[PDB]
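User: Design a sequence. Structure:
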């Protein structure tokens, strides 16, 4: 625990064995907000015994995320016991990650994204139908239930060329199982013990103990094999992975499960945050509709080219991701002793970039608390540092599905907003309050009321 002292870097005093984890009672976002304000440009703390160095300087951020990615800052914090999911790209290391990256990245080229628009359009139709049902009754909507089903429908069909039709089944197996893959929350004596005694991880790995429920991984393990069967019995993410067979049968499933979960969880999450922000700013919700109407007059179906035309939509999406970067923190492990922009960083340290905190630094963002889409306007855009604003990370190891998620959320949003308007109702949580999880999640689902437009 003497490390940060010895290095001259400040921070909260750790407890023996525990480190600074009891500070996690208010969530990672408040912890990082506090430290940033108290300690300044750079601070340090201990997740159990693991030193974590938070950095704030934009050029220093470019160094660990971009310049020295391959050389020293390549991998993320080790995570286990993880079992067969060690193959997964998001937790793969060094050259294994490198070749997994160059394999799967063509999945999301412009051109392949264009192909996905007519495929998503079908589910866009089922989306507007389900919400219309809720606009007729006047009943409240748990948005995570409808945008989730939509996210799940979109990512299965674009990646595996299979229509699991989640949007009509409220009790679809692909959504029940996939949502029960994270969940871990604060103070679970499992994850808590693993942060404090990470030397236990090997034993758990040896006893075949796993973070993910085997029930849930069995179903996902099965489902993907069935989907792989269909393609081999008559070019997307699936196809791209079959062709490499250098993927093992189990490595393929690992990658799939990443994309399935990322598809479902990430997309619907952000969508709920966007929807909330619009419903609580109808001034902004209307200005967006005006734009959607102008670029696509009388309910004209959206296209890849027309999405790129909607400047205000992109502003609104950007501004939500500023307040709600679901990853909260970027991180990368230091492979070897190094000096960067003047600062010594020892081997083994976790270097952490506090996205959430920096998106609210009064130094770069005037009135950081407020939802103001005008921040990202063409005339204002050039004062934003691209290393301060990092909803999708930066460099060779950024979010592989960035552009897909942006297009797909914009697609849903267009289909929704050209048809409906969203008003806050009874059950709606104002102000919004966030869970104490590993990804950014609201405590109690976002509930809004749905009105139809004109007549
Ligand atoms: C708007 C929704 C999304 C947000 C805000 C988001 C954000 C992020 C962030 C911040 C990271 C870490 C990047 C870094 O460490 O620099 C990441 C990684 C990753 N994301 Fe996303 N993401 C989203 C959607 C998606 C989607 C739709 C997919 C797949 C279809 C996906 C797949 C991945 C993968 C595979 C990684 C690990 C990359 C690697 O280590 O090679 N994400 N994402
Ligand atoms: C399959 C896959 O791609 N991935 C597996 C899941 N990965 C992931 C996601 C979130 C995440 O944050 C987990 C949370 C973050 O904080 C702790 C400790 N911790 C682990 C890593 N960094 C900090 C924690 C400490 C003590 C207590 Cl009581 C509860 C928790 Cl919670 O786990 C850690 C890892 C993301 C990548
Ligand atoms: C709280 C904290 O310290 N941290 C929060 C989590 N941070 C983190 C670390 C790694 C990471 O890798 C992206 C991986 C890639 O896919 C997912 C979902 N996802 C999130 C953003 N983009 C995709 C994912 C897939 C499957 C499962 Cl089971 C769980 C998760 Cl998530 O995260 C995404 C986020 C690590 C640090």
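Assistant: Done.
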């Amino acid at each position: 625990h003497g490390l940060f002292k010895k290095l001259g870097i400040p921070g909260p005093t750790p407890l023996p064995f525990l480190g600074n984890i009891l500070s996690y009672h208010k969530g990672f976002c408040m912890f990082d907000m506090e430290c940033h304000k108290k300690y300044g440009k750079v601070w340090g703390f201990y997740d159990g015994q693991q030193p974590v160095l938070a950095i704030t300087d934009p050029d220093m951020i470019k160094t660990v995320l971009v310049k020295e990615c391959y050389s020293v800052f390549t991998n993320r914090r080790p995570f286990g016991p993880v079992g067969f999911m060690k193959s997964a790209i998001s937790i793969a290391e060094d050259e294994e990650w490198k070749r997994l990256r160059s394999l799967l990245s063509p999945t999301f080229t412009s051109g392949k994204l264009k192909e996905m628009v007519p495929i998503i359009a079908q589910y866009g139709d089922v989306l507007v139908r389900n919400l219309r049902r809720e606009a007729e009754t006047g009943k409240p909507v748990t948005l995570k239930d409808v945008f989730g089903a939509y996210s799940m429908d979109v990512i299965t069909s674009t990646s595996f060329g299979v229509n699991i039709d989640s949007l009509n089944n409220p009790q679809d197996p692909f959504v029940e199982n996939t949502k029960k893959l994270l969940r871990f929350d604060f103070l679970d004596p499992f994850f808590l013990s693993i942060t404090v005694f990470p030397f236990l991880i090997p034993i758990l790995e040896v006893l075949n103990i796993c973070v993910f429920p085997r029930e849930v991984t069995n179903f996902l393990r099965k489902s993907v094999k069935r989907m792989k069967e269909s393609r081999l019995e008559d070019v997307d993410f699936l196809q791209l992975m079959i062709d490499s067979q250098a993927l093992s049968d189990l490595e393929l499933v690992a990658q799939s499960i990443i994309f399935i979960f990322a598809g479902y969880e990430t997309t619907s999450s952000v969508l709920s945050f966007i929807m909330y922000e619009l419903a609580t700013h109808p001034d902004v919700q209307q200005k967006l509709q005006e734009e959607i109407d102008a670029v696509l007059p009388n309910k004209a179906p959206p296209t890849y080219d027309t999405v790129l035309q909607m400047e205000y939509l992109d502003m609104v999406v950007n501004e939500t991701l500023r307040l709600f970067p679901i990853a909260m923190r970027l991180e990368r492990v230091c492979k070897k002793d190094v000096e960067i922009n003047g600062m010594f960083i020892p081997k083994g340290v976790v270097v952490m970039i506090p996205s959430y905190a920096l998106h609210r630094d009064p130094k770069y963002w005037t009135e950081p608390e407020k939802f103001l889409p005008e921040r990202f306007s063409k005339k204002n855009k050039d004062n934003i540092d691209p290393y301060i604003y990092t909803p999708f990370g930066s460099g060779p190891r950024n979010c592989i599905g960035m552009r897909f998620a942006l297009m797909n959320m914009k697609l849903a949003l267009i289909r929704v907003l050209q048809n409906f308007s969203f008003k806050p109702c009874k059950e709606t949580q104002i102000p919004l309050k966030l869970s104490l999880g590993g990804l950014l999640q609201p405590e109690k689902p976002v509930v809004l009321k749905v009105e139809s437009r004109d007549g």
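The radius of gyration is 22 Å. The first helix runs from residue 3 to 7.
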